[PDB]
Each structure stands twice: as C-alpha cells, then as structure tokens.
Fold this sequence. Notes:
part of a larger assembly, 3 chains, A: mainly alpha, 2 domains, two-stranded antiparallel sheet, globular, B: mainly alpha, 15 helices, 2 strands, 1% strand, binds ligand SQD, binds the ligand CCCCCCCCCCCCCCCCCC(=O)O[C@@H](COC(=O)CCCCCCCCCCCCCCC)COP(=O)(O)OC[C@H](O)CO, binds beta-carotene, binds zinc ion, NADH dehydrogenase subunit 4 (chain C)
Amino acid sequence: FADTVWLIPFYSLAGMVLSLIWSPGITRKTGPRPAGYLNILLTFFSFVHALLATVAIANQPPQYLHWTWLDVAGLHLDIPVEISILTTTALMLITALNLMAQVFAVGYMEMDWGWARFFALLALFEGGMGALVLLDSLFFNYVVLEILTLATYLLIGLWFNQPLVVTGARDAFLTKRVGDLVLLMGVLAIYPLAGSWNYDDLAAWAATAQVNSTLITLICLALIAGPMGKCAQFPLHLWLDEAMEGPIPASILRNAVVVATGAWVLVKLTPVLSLSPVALTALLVIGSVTALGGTLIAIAQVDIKRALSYLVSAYMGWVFIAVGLKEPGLAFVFILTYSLAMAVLMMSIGSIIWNSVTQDLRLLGGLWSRRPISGISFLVGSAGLLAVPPLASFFPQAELLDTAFAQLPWVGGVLLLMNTFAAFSLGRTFCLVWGGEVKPMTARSPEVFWPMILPMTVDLGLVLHLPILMARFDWVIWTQPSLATAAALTITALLGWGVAAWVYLGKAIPKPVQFPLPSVQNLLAYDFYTPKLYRATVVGVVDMISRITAWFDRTFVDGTGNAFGVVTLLGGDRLKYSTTGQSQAYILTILMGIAILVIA
Amino acid sequence: KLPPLDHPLADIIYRLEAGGALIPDTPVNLMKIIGMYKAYSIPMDFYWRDLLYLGERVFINPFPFFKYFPTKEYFELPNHYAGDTADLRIWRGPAHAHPELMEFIEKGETGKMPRLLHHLWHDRINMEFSEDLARAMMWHRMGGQLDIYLDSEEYKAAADKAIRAYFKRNPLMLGLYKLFPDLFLEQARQATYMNVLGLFWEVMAPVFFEISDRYDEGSITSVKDAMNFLVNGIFAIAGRPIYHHVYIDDEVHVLVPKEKGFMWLYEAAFPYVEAVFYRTSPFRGTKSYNAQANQVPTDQVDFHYGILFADKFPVGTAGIPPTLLHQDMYHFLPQYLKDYFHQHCRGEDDILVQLGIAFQHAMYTVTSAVLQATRAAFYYPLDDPNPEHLMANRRFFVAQMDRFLRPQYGIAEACKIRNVQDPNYL
Amino acid sequence: MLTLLIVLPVIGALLMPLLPERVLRSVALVIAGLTFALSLWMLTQFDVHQSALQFTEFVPWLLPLGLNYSLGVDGLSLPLIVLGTFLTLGVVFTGEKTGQRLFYALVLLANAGITGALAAQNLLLFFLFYELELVPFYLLILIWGGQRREQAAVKFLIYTAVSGILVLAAFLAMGWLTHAPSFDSADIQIAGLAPTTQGILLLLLILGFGIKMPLVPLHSWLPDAYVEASTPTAILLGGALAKLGAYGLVRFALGYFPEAWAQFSGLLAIVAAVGIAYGALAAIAQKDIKRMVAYSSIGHMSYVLLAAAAHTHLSMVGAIAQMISHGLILALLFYLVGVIETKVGTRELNVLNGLLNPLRGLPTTSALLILGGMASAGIPGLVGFVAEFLIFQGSYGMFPLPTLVAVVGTGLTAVYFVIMINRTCFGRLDNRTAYYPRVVWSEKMPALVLTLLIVFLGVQPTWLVRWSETTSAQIVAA
Ligand SMILES: CCCCCCCCCCCCCCCC(=O)OC[C@H](CO[C@@H]1O[C@H](CS(=O)(=O)O)[C@@H](O)[C@H](O)[C@H]1O)OC(=O)CCCCCCCCCCCCCCC
Ligand SMILES: CCCCCCCCCCCCCCCC(=O)OC[C@H](CO[C@@H]1O[C@H](CS(=O)(=O)O)[C@@H](O)[C@H](O)[C@H]1O)OC(=O)CCCCCCCCCCCCCCC
Ligand SMILES: CCCCCCCCCCCCCCCC(=O)OC[C@H](CO[C@@H]1O[C@H](CS(=O)(=O)O)[C@@H](O)[C@H](O)[C@H]1O)OC(=O)CCCCCCCCCCCCCCC
Ligand SMILES: CCCCCCCCCCCCCCCCCC(=O)O[C@@H](COC(=O)CCCCCCCCCCCCCCC)COP(=O)(O)OC[C@H](O)CO
Ligand SMILES: CC1=C(/C=C/C(C)=C/C=C/C(C)=C/C=C/C=C(C)/C=C/C=C(C)/C=C/C2=C(C)CCCC2(C)C)C(C)(C)CCC1
Ligand SMILES: [Zn+2]
C-alpha cells in the first residue's frame, strides 16, 4: 500500500459519524454496543493498513505529496502529506494505542449508556492524531491542533452532570486554547519571514537566515508557548490535574495525545527554534522546572489518577529538555517508549480503580497476593520508564545524559535528579496500592474480567520486546556506551525506588507520613496552589476589567446616548409653556418680533 | 395511641405505625407500582438464571467470552416454586420460564435471529447490571453471615479442590494457580457472591409475578395490601437454603454446603437491601472520585447511592448505571402503563425517565415491606396495647428514618423521599 | 433581473392585505422561496473574472434629483444579497404565530429594501432603500419582542435615523462639491478634490455607517435591540442591517476616498482592535445569553473594520468572508437561543443548566449551540476560522499590533462562549423545573441547515471566496 496511507485519518472520521447513530435519542432501542464495536473494527483496519504501509517503506525515500486547500490572492494554502518512515510508524503507534484503549473501554465502560458520545470522540482523536502526524505544514499542524482542543473539551466533559467536570473541562479548554492562540501569533509572523510553512521551507529558511535576533526570539517564544500549553507544562499545567475526570481517555490522552500533540509540533520546529539561542535556554528552563515540579508534586499526592498525570508533565518536560539540546531524534525515540510504558501504567491503575471504587491512596492496600497481573504490569511499566537498561526507555535517556554533559552540564544534574524523584513516586504508588496491610475499601478485590487485562497484558508484551526489537534491526540510540554514565541512571532510579519501598513496606514509620517541615507537604500536595494563582493573576484581572467594561457600557456609553434624547424631551416639556394661553401675551411676542428684526 | 414527637419526617412515621405505606396510597400510585413489578420481574427472571449459570458453569473462566448464553436447560430449570413440583408454590403459573422472556430471547426487538447476533446488535437483556449488583454486595462485605465463613479453612480447601478440578485440562492456568494461589481464589469468591445474588432473585421473581396476578384478579386494592403480600412472601421464604454447588465435567463440588445453615433472609435479603437499595457504590457521572475533593465517603457505611437515593432525571445519559436496567425494563411493560406514560411529559420519548421514577416508587414500597417485616420479626405488632411495646416500634422507625436525614455528604439532599410523596414527581 | 429581486417581496407585502390566512402563510413561503431561488440562479450565472458590474439596469427616474433607477451587482454585493434572501426565507419559515399578516408583509418589505440597497449603483437610491429599511424593523421590534420592547425599539429607530442623516449629509455634500449631476455611482461622481474636506466627508460616512455596522462606541443600540426582539426579528435585523452598514462603509468610504482612508488607517486599526477587545470583555460580564450573542455580533463586525483598515487584496476577501460568516453564525446562534428561551422559558445563565442530557433535557439544540459557539470563536473546520484567518494574514503586512490585539479578542470570544456553554449545556437538570416541551421536527430544520452550511464552508472554503476575489482586487488595487 503506502500510497493510500493518507486515508487513515478518514477511517476513524468515518467512525465518528456512524457511532452517533446509537446516541440514546436516535435508536431508543437496543443501543450502546455496536458503536464501540464498529469503532474497534475501524481502528483495527486502520492499524493493519498502517503496518503494511510501514513494511512497504522499509528501505525507500520519503514520498511527499500535496493538495491545495485554497488559493486566494496572496496566500496559497498547501496541504502536504509526508510518507516518511517516522510518519507511518507514528500512525502504527497511534492506531495500536487507540485499539488498546478501546478494547479497554469495552470492559470499563459497561454499566454506562453513553458510547455514542464516548467512542465518537475517541474516533475524532484517532483521526486528529493521524492528520497531525501525516500533515507537515505548520498551518495545518495548528488546524487539527485546535480541533483537538475542542475535542478535549467535549471529551473530558463526557459526564457533565458532575460539577467538577464542567470545571475541569473549562480549564482544559481555556488553558489549552490560549497556548494554541499564541501559537497562532507565531505561525502568523513566520510567513513574512519564510514565505511559507511546510516544515521544509522553514528548514531551508532557518539554514540560511540573518534576520533580527529579538524578532526570531519573540516568534520562537510563541512557537514554544503553543506546545507549552498543549503538553501540560508550567505554568499551563493545572488543566491536566483537572483533566483526570473520565477514565481511559486518560489512558490515551496522557499517553497518546499529550505525547504527540505539542511535543510533535515542538520537535519538528527544531530548525526554527535553533535560530535563537535564547528560546533554547528558555526551553531548557521550562522543561527542567516542570520536570522537578511534576516529580515533587506526584510524590505528594493521594489520588492514584493524579499521581501519574504530574509524572506525565515531568516526562514531557524531559522532551522539552531534549529538544532544547537540538536533539529531535532522542525526542522522537523517547516518545515511543514513554507512551508504551505510560499506557501500561494507566491501564493497570484503571483496572485497580474499576473494582476498588476509591481512588484514595490512603484507602487502598494489600493487593499483590490477590491481584499479580495488574501489579506486575505496573512494575514493568515502571521499569520501562526510568532505568533497567534491559528495558527500552534507558537508551534515549542515556544520550541525553551524554549530550547534557558534553554541553551545559547543570541540565544533566536535573535529568539525573529527575530520575530518582520520579522513581520515588512510582515506588510509593506501588507500595501503597499493592503492598502493605489490606484496608475496608479493598477487603474483597476480585481481579477484573478479560477485556480490561487483555490490552494491559498485550501492551505489557510490547514494552518487553521494545529492547529486543531494537536489536534485530540495528537501531542504535546511544552510540558510545561509556558505562560510567550507564551506571548512574540505574543507581539513581534504584535508590529512589528502594527508599520508596523502605518507607512504606518498612513499618518503621507512621503510615500517614508527615514531613519534618509540615508547610511544604501541603504545598506540594496542592500543586503550589496553582488555582489560587490563576484566580489571582489572569482570571482576577480578566474578570475585574470585564465587570468594569460592561458597567461602563451600561453607564457611560449608553447614558451618553440617552442624555441627548432625555434633553430633547425636557426641551419640549418645558418649552410648551411658551404658549401661555393669553392672547395679549401672543400679541406681545408678535410685537417683540418687530422692533428686533428691525434692529437686526 | 402515642403523642406526636418532633420529626420533620414524622408525617411518614405516623403512616408506618398505622399500617404501612412509606409512600402515599392513591390508586394511580399503585397502578404504576404493580406495572413496574410486572416489568421488573421478567428481566429479573432472566437475571436469576444467568447468575446461577455464572456461579455454577462459568465458575472461574479466564475468557468467559459468552457468559451471557445460558445453556438450553437453564431456561427449563424449574424455578423452585411456581408449579406443581414446587417448594412453597407462589405464582401459580408455569415453573420453567416465562413466555414473555422466552419470546424476547427468541425475537428480541428486531426479529427472529440467532442469539449471538442478538448480542452483537445490542438487543439484549443488559445482564451487566446484575453483575454490577453482585460485585456491589461484595466489596461492601454485605453478604451476611457467610462472608465471615467465606474466608478460610472450609472455603479455601473447597475452592482449592474446585479450581484444581476445573483447570485440569490446560497446564498454563494450573501453573498460574500454583504461582499465585490467591488470584483465582478471589475470583472463586466472586462466583460465590454471584450465586448468592442469583439465589435471591429466584424468590423475588415469583413474588413480583404473583403480585401482578393478584392485582389483575382484584385482590390487591391498596398499597397496604401490596406491601402486606410482600411481607408475607418475605416471611414464607425466610428459611430457604443458600449454597454454591459448582458443576464441573461429570462432577459437582460442594463449595458452600447446605449443612452450614445459611438462610435466605440473613444471607441474601437483608445484606442485599442495604447493598443495592442503600449503598450501590457511587455513580461515575454524578460524583467525583477525586480523593482531595472530599465528595465520596471514606467509610462504606455512608454510601448513599442506592435506588432509594438515586437521581432519575439523568437517565439514558453517560455515566449512570441504572439506565442499563431501565432500558431492560422498558419493553416488558404492561399496556396500562404505556398508556399512562404516553399521555404525559414528552410522551413516549422520555419514557425511560418516568419509567425509572415509577421504579423508584415501587422500590420504596419494597423497602417499606422490608421495614415492616423487620419490625414484625424483631419487634412488636401494631395491634399491641402496651405502651412500651409501642414505643419500641417508634424508636425503630425513628432510627430507620434517621438514615434518611444524616447530613454527612448531602445524604439528606439526596434521599428521594419527601420527593416521592409529591404527586408531581413523575 | 434584479428588478425581480426587489419587486417580488414588495408584491408579497402589498398582497398580504386582502388575502385569506391559509393563503397568507402559503404565499409568503412561496414568495420568499422564489426570491431565494432566483438569488441562487443569479449566483451561478455570476461568471467570475469580470472585474466590472453585472446584471446592470438603468432607467432615468427623477432627473431634478439625480435618482436614476440604476442597479448592478458586483462580487462584494451579490453574496450579501444571497445571504439576505436566505435569511428572509428562514425568517418567513419560522414566522410568528400571532398577528401573522403584518409580519410577512413587513418581512418581505425589509428583504426588498435590503436587496435594493445592496444592488444600487446610485447614491440617493441607496439612501432611499436605507431609510426604507429604517421603519419596518422598528415595527418588528415593537409588535413582537420582550418586556422592554418600546424603549429598545425607540433606541434602534433613532440610532438608525441619525445614521441616515450622516449618510445623506455626506452624499449631498459629496454630490455637490464635485458639481456632478446624476448621483449614480461608478460615474461622474469623481472626488478629485482638496484634503481637509475629504477628511470631513470620510468621517461623516464612517460615523453614519459605523453606527449601523456597528463600531465600538456607536453600538449602544445593538444590545438593547437584539435582546428585546423575537428570534426571527433578531436574525433578520442582525444579518440584513449589519451587512448593509458594513457594505456601505466598505463600498463608499473605500471607493470614494482612497487618499483619506490611507491616512485614517492608522487610527481605524486601533479602533477596530479596541472594538474586538471591548465586545469580548463586555460579553464576558453579561449574565443573559442574548446579550452575550449581541456582543459577539459587535466583536465580529469589528473584524471587518480591521480588515478594511488595511488595503490588502487578501484583507478584503477576508472582510467579505467575515461578513458572510458572521451572518451565518449569528443566524444560527439567535435561532438556537430562541428555541432554548421558548422551551425552557428563561434566558439567564444561573438557572439554565444541563441542557445536554438525551431524554429529559433538549440535546440537539445544545449540541448545535456548542458547534455554533465554537464557530463564532476561532476554531478550524468552521467558517469563522477561515474568515478571521484571511483577515489576519491580510492585516499583518500592515500594522502588526492591532492584528495581535484582534487575536487576543478571538481568545476572549472563546472564553465567554465557553462560559455560556458550560452554564447552559453542561451541568445537571433541576428536578422541579424540568419537563421541557418536545422540539418538533420542522422547527429545528433551519438550525440543522445553517449548521450543515457552516460545517461545509469551513472545510471546503473555496465556495466562500471564489465570488469576491476579482472584485476585491478591483476595490483595493485601484
Ligand atoms: C458537537 C458536535 C455537534 C454535532 C452533532 C450533530 C447534531 C445532532 C444531529 C441530529 C440528527 C438529526 C436528528 C436529531 C433529532 C433526533 O433525531 O431526535 C432528538 C433526540 C434528542 O432527544 C430529543 O430531544 C428533542 C429535543 S431536542 O431535539 O434535542 O432539541 C425532543 O424530541 C425529545 O427531547 C428528545 O427525544 O435525539 C437527538 O437528537 C440527540 C442525539 C442527537 C444529538 C447528538 C449530540 C450528542 C453528541 C454531541 C457531541 C458530538 C461529539 C462527536 C463529534 C462531534
Ligand atoms: C545519593 C544518595 C541517594 C539518595 C536519594 C534520595 C531520594 C529520596 C526521594 C525523594 C524524596 C521526596 C521528598 C519530597 C516529599 C514530599 O514533598 O512530600 C512527602 C510525601 C507526602 O505524601 C503524603 O501522604 C500522606 C498519606 S501517605 O503517607 O502517602 O500514606 C498524606 O497525608 C499527604 O497528604 C501526602 O501528601 O510523603 C513522602 O513521600 C515522604 C518521603 C520522605 C522520606 C525520606 C526519608 C529518608 C529515609 C532514610 C532512608 C532509609 C534507609 C533505607 C536505605 C535503602
Ligand atoms: C493575548 C491574547 C490571547 C490570549 C487569550 C485571552 C486571555 C484568556 C485568559 C483566560 C481568562 C479567564 C477568563 C475569565 C473567566 C471569568 O470571567 O471568571 C472566572 C471563571 C468563572 O467565571 C464564571 O463562569 C461561570 C460559568 S462556569 O460554571 O464557570 O463555567 C458563570 O456562571 C459565571 O458568571 C462566570 O463569572 O473561572 C475561571 O477563572 C476559569 C478560567 C481558567 C482559565 C485557565 C487559565 C488560562 C490562561 C493560562 C494562564 C497562564 C498564566 C497564569 C499565571 C502564571
Ligand atoms: C460623543 C460621545 C460618544 C459616546 C457614545 C455616544 C454616541 C451616541 C450617538 C447619538 C445618537 C443619538 C441617540 C439619541 C438617543 C435616543 C434614545 C432614546 O431614548 O430616545 C428618547 C427620545 O428620543 C428623542 O427625543 C428623539 C430626539 C433625539 C435626537 C437626538 C439627536 C442626536 C444627534 C447628535 C448630533 C449633534 C449635532 C452636532 C453637529 C456639530 C426616549 O428615551 P426614553 O427613556 O423615554 O425611552 C422610552 C421611550 O421614551 C418610550 O416610548
Ligand atoms: C485474562 C486474565 C488472565 C490471563 C491473561 C493472559 C495469560 C494474558 C496473556 C497475554 C499474553 C501472553 C500476551 C503476549 C503478548 C505478546 C506480544 C504482544 C508480542 C509481540 C511481539 C512482537 C511485537 C515482535 C516483534 C518482532 C519480532 C520479535 C519478530 C519480528 C518483528 C520484530 C520486533 C520487529 C488470567 C488467567 C490470569 C485471569 C485473570 C486475567
Ligand atoms: Zn455479550
């Protein structure tokens, strides 16, 4: 095939219109299941197509093609698609992940009547993801990037009867829209400079460019701030903490959307972002800050679903760091491994939640003996994210140690440190959900049925084969071994996980652990009071002046338009008295007419 | 016979002390109640067969792909008492199945198709709601006195024998059971709770069958008589046994024995009323499980999410379990209720919402029958001359109405009563 | 041909009296549909790459006044006429179920006036059809409407009457300072005179058309006359009159004073940016839905001024596309909000809730409301994004700071539309106040057609632009 791969984003776009045939007001009889079934069928057929297209482009050059969206006077909106290897590979990655999450949803979303609304939005992501990875125009890489913002709004707000979803979906749309809107300012000021937006004309332009320093500084800062909000990075990160309403888009959003929506735009902008060595240092700063913050906050959480989204923020800040060192290959490689591991992690946590209703880490307990798979899957998804050079996420985080040590060493000091705190979080998330004494809420925890642990175990296999899948085909990631640094990440991670296990499986400390400093514990627990920050700086401003403007309109403008009228009323109501009703007065006015016009 | 005391719910206690009727006793209020019983009894008649199929034939199936296709003979399974060879013989009608249920299995809502094709195209009996209840009785520990028995040294041995006899074909599963012996041992417990719940609905299906026939004849004239029939049927069956009896190839494994002395009232009726009518783990599209937002309780004693507390206007929307039953309880409707709904709000469009409100009404009288049976069992009758014997009943009713007022987590701002007493709630 | 477009609604209006009721409604539908279909046929035969007038008609009428009956349709004018006729067909289809004989008459008269004013190559004839539009909309605001009809209606009247004055004051003047007879445009009317007077005439035309468009400080009739008007009245008024004002401003103030416009561009760009920001920030604070949508109209009309402040060939295709997009989107939003107010019986943002769940709570007008609100804001796949992006790409080569402020205004538009959708569609239903009546099949047809056209023109946008590509070139490149 490989010449019709551009039809992949339509299969799912054909499932996003057909699944709505079953929404509860259209069928009213026998509804809720074949919508999901046919969406699974479409996803499987689009994954087979992508696999075949990848096999057919094993040893071949990128065969671009393009259509014309519209050609008005000045601009020529070109929609080009690239059929390189990393495009069909990303299509496989997206469709397989959607297949896993949808087979999961078949099991999780029972006892739920909205499958029209759920699987149609899950099909509109699988289509949007494909259209984002295929199309390589900075303009059409923003069109879908905004359509997916709208889709995120309706998907988080799936069950809108819950008052904390209509508040989480509000932030998830506004926070993610502002970033996508300064990205518009950036894509808008790159046309007079480069004459196009094709990721190739931009590459050629950035190769030979001598334009102002502050100008490209500003436009690349905008190009940063777009994906900065799309990838849940500081300070646009509260939306992800509140986007944990509605399980398993969370298994796909934190895993297949957050990973290849802003990071994909940020990586393909490496040639442009390389032009200013200030956008790069700002990129390093943002990535490192969000990594440290995400790890430290994930350590201080009690909700198992929010003790993994901050880790998502941190491991996307890692990609921000990598792309800050002019290393796009490392980012494209690490997205794959991180996505596989986080899929296993989120599916295991979802399986625990489905049968152990609470999400409080303080209410979940001994599950290892009675729930093995869901535990070993979590453990393997853990090992495939930090360390264990056997597992595949080690390789891409090895070059970023060598590269961050060759140049700008302090950044490595974060990447190393980010490897222990992120290991202490997962540790305390395993030692709290699977180890320890069993508690009332999880006193009787049956393992879940076949559709929730099939994808989980099928996705647990991919992670175990990734390392060996990069052996058969010599896809070397970190050229120089230099085991002096390969023995650092492992030591850091193992140390973190070990201290985590000791603190919680040690019964040598009170279990509701308190920090020597109590004021920082309830500061990392409330993510540095980011909401109280928002409602203070932006909202508080945008609201205040808003309540001014309307009031102004209601008082100064409107009134100024009414005063005239009112005056013209008074001028008539108190000038009728000139007709006094006395004929002698009328003759006086007639006589005052004369002897005055005679004077004038 | 006693003074008025203080309560805001006192107007209801004076009705419980004098007869019954946790809800008013108008004729339009009882037509819908009996129609909802008739509508809820046929899917229940499938539920109690499929749950027994799960508890005996699908004991621990890693891939119970079908799991909702009971064998041909489980529709011929004699309901222990409906016919000639009955055990207590209520609901005179045939004791094998229901013609209406067999018709729906045959033709569904489209036409005479194979059952597998009736499943893929949903057209089913929404069996996932009965499993959710079975998993809701467990995890609340509310099984009765066998949950304490369902722990060790008599069950673990029987479960071990049953599991080793079940997987004997494939050594993959056998080997797995050797590594993690508590993995399939907790799935055995689940099949046991499935069997318990399926044995509870082998009693309520004939009761709800026969009450509709009594209403048809004319023996039922007021809600008091309906709940009294319910109480009499409750006491009549309070002694029936509870067991598991997992059947494997040419073999039966006595998992929980009949000789243990588990009866229907203390192990399937009372632990069920509290589990599904009161607790019913929280809705996913109404409350946030967010651990910081202290919305879902921490103890399982304050789970106010049952049918008595449910919110039935968002029915047919995403994230709300009871819809699965209201679509299941919709095409088995008697005609005098379809006509009653068709001349009302939004007609035959929002029929699920009013069909669920009427179900709430019906379950209110069911739980009132449970209250009356409870007091007649553990306390004194209404026709008692002594004043202390009447103050005991009043204390019991005040305690049982205080469960409807506890303001821990808006448990008082749920609790559809004082809203069901309204004739304009439908 | 255009004479038919102008006379058929006039004939229907004169025929609404002396006609039996059943025939009253059927014949109104017939006349509106006929005018609409004729508009589409004209649009097909509009063969493009012409750069001149088409379908022209010239008759001498009132020689001592100029006032020749001189029609003619261009690329700027024809899409607006088709839009007016479509909106008229819709408004007639969902007409009022009360006093419905003086309604079809006045609606047909209003459409006649709009179509005439658009396709008129005579200044005084344009003003004739303008002040003809003046009064029937007053009658529509006055008979049908809300609690505060009278005040509201009066406001509209005067702020439109004053409008006429300025326009007339700037026609007569610029019709005599050039000693030209025969006020008809594209003709002896040639400015070619000294500055300091072109400035005054241009300011008169700005204040006379910016008060109807409406612009930033001249808008204070729009919130009062959109909210106290029934939904068909609101749709027709918004679309028709707003586009009449914008068309007037563009055509006259850019084809007659291109030397003064190039000097006032620097101020008009900042005025348009302030207008977008002002509309957005004033909509954010409102707690009634129709008020939010009215300020949406203000903000979306300021885009046309920002586009016209730059003489780019692109920034004028974008202006016409923004006019059409705002017409469609405002029609959709007003129709949906009218349906909601009818079925729910309230329009506040603190009692509306949960209008999106299937059975008991109005879910296909809420879904459409979320699709229209996202089209209004800048969201690709819909028409608003195409129009706004054409404007932005055309206006960045010129002054770049007002364009950035316009982008911020689009963001704030998204903000308040999300506010409205959250407090209107999401949430839970109040279980004492529910029991909304059902929505009948041929009552959500107009919204479901507008939605299809919006989603179509946003993914295949050529059919929005291929009509005003050469005409915009003739407008700015001259
Ligand atoms: C955001 C994307 C927007 C795209 C959605 C397209 C709009 C829906 C197309 C409808 C096709 C025409 C038939 C509709 C009328 C009908 O058949 O019965 C009307 C009934 C509604 O209930 C009925 O509601 C009626 C009131 S009312 O119609 O809903 O206004 C009334 O008849 C009675 O209440 C009740 O039964 O059924 C419905 O129409 C509800 C289903 C249709 C609405 C689906 C919306 C759910 C998805 C929203 C988000 C989409 C996300 C996916 C990707 C975008
Ligand atoms: C080169 C040397 C290598 C060493 C590397 C060191 C890396 C350490 C990992 C990083 C530590 C993270 C600090 C941030 C903690 C925080 O902010 O919140 C604190 C959180 C709050 O969770 C709280 O949890 C509470 C309930 S519960 O406890 O989670 O159950 C809840 O009430 C509260 O709201 C919730 O927030 O709880 C913690 O995780 C405390 C961790 C601190 C314990 C460190 C003590 C050191 C022990 C000595 C080692 C023993 C020897 C064993 C040798 C193998
Ligand atoms: C530069 C140009 C381009 C940039 C884009 C333009 C700027 C957009 C910024 C968004 C400003 C928020 C709008 C104000 C909302 C409001 O009026 O009331 C406040 C609303 C409640 O409004 C309430 O909403 C209620 C409805 S609802 O239930 O809340 O939904 C309603 O009933 C009530 O009347 C209403 O007041 O509550 C909120 O504040 C939610 C807003 C969350 C937005 C997240 C931040 C997005 C920007 C990222 C910030 C990064 C920097 C932060 C500091 C480091
Ligand atoms: C410079 C400041 C700019 C800020 C914004 C202001 C710009 C406004 C533009 C002015 C347009 C004229 C507005 C006229 C207001 C009419 C509104 C009105 O209310 O009408 C009243 C009465 O209207 C009239 O009297 C008509 C006379 C109005 C004439 C106004 C002409 C103003 C034009 C200004 C030009 C000045 C000349 C300068 C030339 C150098 C009735 O008020 P009411 O509360 O009673 O309403 C209810 C009604 O009465 C019940 O039926
Ligand atoms: C249900 C359940 C269970 C079980 C389950 C299971 C048992 C599962 C399994 C699963 C599995 C067992 C899975 C597996 C998987 C595998 C995979 C997924 C693989 C893959 C592979 C690959 C991918 C490869 C590749 C390659 C090679 C090697 C060759 C060529 C190519 C290359 C790379 C390229 C039980 C009983 C406990 C009960 C409860 C739950
Ligand atoms: Zn099935």
